[PDB]
């Protein structure tokens, strides 16, 4: 359905969820920050 961490984020608000976009290719989901 969506990515999850480490998949392949399309959005930085969390693809799957509680993520956000990675802003280095490739773009993966990584845990927001310090969640």
């Known amino acids: ?8 984020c399309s959005k930085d608000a969390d693809c799957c969820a509680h993520l956000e976009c990675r802003k280095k290719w490739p773009y993966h989901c990584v845990w927001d920050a310090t969640v």
């Open 1 to 8: 359905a969506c990515r999850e961490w480490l998949g392949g």
